[PDB]
Design a protein around this nucleic acid. Structure first.
Ligand SMILES: [Zn+2]
Ligand SMILES: [Zn+2]
Lengths: 117, 48, 50
DNA sequence: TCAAGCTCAAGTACTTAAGCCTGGTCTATACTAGTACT
DNA sequence: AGTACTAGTATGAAAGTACTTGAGCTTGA
């Protein structure tokens, strides 16, 4: 489905707003401070995830691997480069529903690969 | 089920406050819905 | 302690007896559990008297 | 269809927060008017 | 006569309940 996103006008750089073309039945975006119009490519407008199953692998930063206060195991090798050190931690996120799942971040410089088991 | 007890619950009964911290309602079942957990979960869905 | 340690030692279980003596951290957590006793005794008396 | 009356909900304002006891320290400042000295 | 000093006089981390006001809805003309 997609979580969609904003679009900005190209003249006054304001927020475009979705509106309906009544003649051609084509979704348009129009700034309200000028006459600028643009055709909607995505065709979805407002999308809301209530169940909100969230992918934490997107939020996790690779720099986390430098923290002394996080644990690490040589049990789980890196999936990409096959490095033994992995520094694992939990959600660290409020409103996570119920997750004790560990997320893994590969140590060694610049790898930064982030997986979940 | 966490319910209030002790002195905080005593101010509620004494003051007769309109909104208690922990209002609760115990509900007993008549027929076969009392013995069977499945028949009970059915009524459980109707009260919630 | 290390981040996200839910083990018994990190979260306050004291495995020592007053006779063998508490280890440094168990001394601090034991002090955190006793403060909750002192506070209650100071607070409840003024409510139970009103 | 419009106006008036009644009811309900929301917002604002007012009253209370343990029992006894022992010690201590500290208590206006500013402005104006009147009097004295140079 | 003017200026300065002294003395006196004048002024964040409460909670809950009840009442009043405003708005909305229904009924009557
Ligand atoms: Zn524009
Ligand atoms: Zn790696």
């Amino acid at each position: 489905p997609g979580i969609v996103g904003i679009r900005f006008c190209q003249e006054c750089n304001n927020m475009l707003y979705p509106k309906e073309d009544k003649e051609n039945r084509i979704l348009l975006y129009a700034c309200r401070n000028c006459d600028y119009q643009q055709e909607a490519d995505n065709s979805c407008i407002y999308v809301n995830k209530i169940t909100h199953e969230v992918d934490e692998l997107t939020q996790i930063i690779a720099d986390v691997s430098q923290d002394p206060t996080l644990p690490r195991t040589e049990d789980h090798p890196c999936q990409k480069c096959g490095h033994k050190e992995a520094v694992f931690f939990q959600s660290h996120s409020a409103r996570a529903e119920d997750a004790m799942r560990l997320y893994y971040v590969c140590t060694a410089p610049h790898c930064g690969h982030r997986w979940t088991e | 089920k966490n319910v209030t007890l002790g002195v905080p619950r005593l101010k509620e009964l004494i003051n007769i406050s309109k909104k208690p911290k922990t209002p609760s309602l115990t509900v007993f079942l008549l027929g076969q819905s009392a013995r069977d957990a499945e028949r009970a979960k059915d009524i459980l869905c109707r009260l919630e | 302690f290390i981040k996200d340690d839910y083990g018994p030692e990190s979260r306050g279980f004291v495995e020592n007896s007053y006779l063998a003596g508490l280890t440094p951290t168990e001394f601090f957590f034991h002090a955190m559990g006793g403060r909750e006793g002192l506070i209650d005794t100071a607070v409840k008396t003024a409510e139970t008297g009103y």
